[PDB]
Design a protein around this nucleic acid. Structure first.
Ligand SMILES: Nc1nc2c(ncn2[C@@H]2O[C@H](COP(=O)(O)OP(=O)(O)NP(=O)(O)O)[C@@H](O)[C@H]2O)c(=O)[nH]1
Ligand code: MET
Ligand SMILES: [Mg+2]
Ligand SMILES: [Mg+2]
Ligand SMILES: [Mg+2]
Lengths: 36, 414
RNA sequence: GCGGGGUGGAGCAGCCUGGUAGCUCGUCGGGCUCAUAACCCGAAGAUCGUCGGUUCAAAUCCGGCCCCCGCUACCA
């Protein structure tokens, strides 16, 4: 996903793995969701 | 003995709870319409119902008590065996708007319409509204009013609500639909009632030219629990023949029917078979002609058919044409007010992405959209359509408090 | 044709096997922490619809009456 490794530092945010997985659940959508 | 025939008619009954639909069909048939167990105990119309009766008139007696449904004429006291007029079919809708939407299926199969009214309930009643306007949708404007409970109303309030009846019809297509005094539990003059169903509701013109399609409403399995593997049967699939005629042992395809995973996406299968037998109940015939919900027992698997899986199925020939489309274009007409409810608010011009219920004749689906044109709609689905030709009646309902009520009547352009 | 419980504010436990409504969420209040919630323990709390019978003696075994009423005759 063209990683940018300044984000994993978990300082004032949330994990990165479990944000990727949630962006997929919306790209799979705006692709499927009447993006036809 | 009456020389047997299959029906010629359909009279779908519409109306709300307590308005008297169950026992009025008990009254015109001799048998009831609440056909499920939780229904049996709870007492509300949950099933899209069905009913059948015979008609024989005694030419000698006065008007009208001759119209009773057996080969005898001593209801009116006539010595003669009556002349036969037809065997009849009544299709029984629910009353509740928590269970309104589904009913529109059977609507695509009525050769008339019946609305029963509460003469001990003020004006206007909630679900008779939605029932009568959906009738206005289905292109069957033939209405039979009855003012019910002539046995708990004062004999003047009945007249006031009768005026209210003639009035409610004024301003809608049904200025010329009758008002006959009969009631549900008390069988009071059901005879001139059938006389009126005969006189006022005529037969809609039948045609055997387009592809014979049976637009199904029921589908069941004859096999009782514990049936040996020797007298095993297919499934029964039941509609009525509006265009054409179907026959036992005939090649046919059913649609949509069976869904299967073909190339990683979702899709169905139109299913070939031939008929194991044809009947209307308990008499022996072999080729179903127009008139009445006919039952067609087939060569398929029974598990495909039980529990109303293909509610609103369609049957045509396995060499015939009825399309299926995941994306459907439908010209839709907006409804004027919130008919079947306590409360009637404005009809809003919406934008898309809202999720609405689209019932295709006897079929039904959900839908969403991306281009909302002024007059038509391009709706994306999850299951294809049963559209034998142009502008077939698919209706749109929007959620109201868990009750999906009408927001337009649409016709499918293909 | 029937047939069931006839129970504290709430789950009704407990009924032929007979004497302590029987615990449990909830209401008052007392403990521990700094303080809260979890946690602990006293208190309130109906006393078996009700007239009875049987029963030394009772919901306990049997009946009058009535509360609510829960299952009474569907597969093309
Ligand atoms: N004697 C009598 N009883 C009636 C009449 N209309 C309704 N009832 C009674 O009212 C109760 C409920 O009415 P119902 O017959 O179910 O009316 P409905 O419109 O068919 N309701 P649904 O279709 O949901 O079953 C039943 O006990 C029915 O016998 C009537 O005209 N006469
Ligand atoms: C699914 S077919 C329904 C009709 C059937 N004969 C009954 O009665
Ligand atoms: Mg770096
Ligand atoms: Mg009913
Ligand atoms: Mg504390």
């Amino acid at each position: 996903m063209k990683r940018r490794p300044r984000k994993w530092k978990k300082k004032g945010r949330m994990r990165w793995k479990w944000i990727k997985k949630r962006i997929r659940r919306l790209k799979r959508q705006r692709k499927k969701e009447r993006g036809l | 003995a009456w020389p047997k025939v299959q029906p010629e008619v359909n009279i779908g009954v519409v109306g709300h709870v307590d308005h008297g639909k169950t026992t009025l069909v008990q009254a015109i048939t001799g048998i009831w319409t609440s056909k499920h167990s939780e229904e049996l105990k709870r007492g509300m119309t949950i099933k899209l119902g069905y009913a059948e009766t015979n008609i024989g008139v005694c030419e000698s007696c006065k008007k009208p008590e001759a119209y009773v449904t057996e080969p005898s004429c001593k209801s009116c006291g006539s010595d003669d065996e009556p002349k036969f007029l037809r065997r009849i079919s009544f299709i029984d809708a629910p009353g509740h708007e928590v269970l309104m939407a589904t009913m529109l299926s059977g609507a695509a199969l009525m050769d008339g319409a019946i609305l029963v009214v509460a003469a001990n309930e003020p004006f206007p009643q909630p679900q008779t509204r939605e029932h009568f306007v959906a009738l206005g949708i289905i292109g069957v404007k033939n209405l039979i009013i009855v003012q019910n409970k002539v046995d708990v109303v004062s004999k003047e309030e009945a007249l006031s609500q009768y005026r209210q009846i003639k009035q409610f019809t004024k301003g809608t297509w049904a200025e010329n639909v009758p008002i006959i005094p009969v009631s549900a539990l008390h069988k009071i003059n059901i005879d001139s009632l059938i006389e009126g169903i005969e006189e006022y509701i005529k037969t809609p013109y039948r045609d055997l030219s387009q592809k014979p399609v049976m637009l199904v409403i029921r589908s069941f399995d004859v096999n009782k629990p514990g049936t040996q593997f020797n007298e095993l049967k297919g499934g029964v699939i039941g509609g009525s023949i509006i265009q054409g005629l179907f026959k036992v042992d005939q090649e046919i395809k059913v649609l949509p029917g069976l869904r299967v995973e073909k190339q990683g996406k979702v899709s169905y299968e139109p299913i070939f078979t031939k008929i194991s037998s044809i009947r209307f109940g308990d008499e022996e015939f072999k080729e179903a002609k127009p008139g009445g919900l006919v039952a067609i027992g087939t060569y398929l698997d029974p598990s495909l058919t039980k529990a109303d899986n293909l509610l609103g199925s369609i049957i045509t020939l396995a060499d015939a044409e009825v399309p299926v489309l995941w994306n459907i274009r439908i010209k839709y007409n907006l409804l004027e007010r919130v008919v079947g409810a306590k409360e009637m608010l404005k009809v809003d011009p919406i934008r898309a992405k809202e999720t609405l219920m689209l019932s295709v004749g006897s079929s039904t689906t959900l839908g969403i959209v991306t281009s909302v044109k002024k007059d038509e709609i391009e709706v994306e689905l999850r299951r294809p359509v049963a559209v034998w030709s142009n502008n077939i009646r698919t209706v749109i309902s929007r959620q109201i408090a868990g009750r999906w009520r009408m927001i337009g009547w649409g016709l499918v352009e293909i």
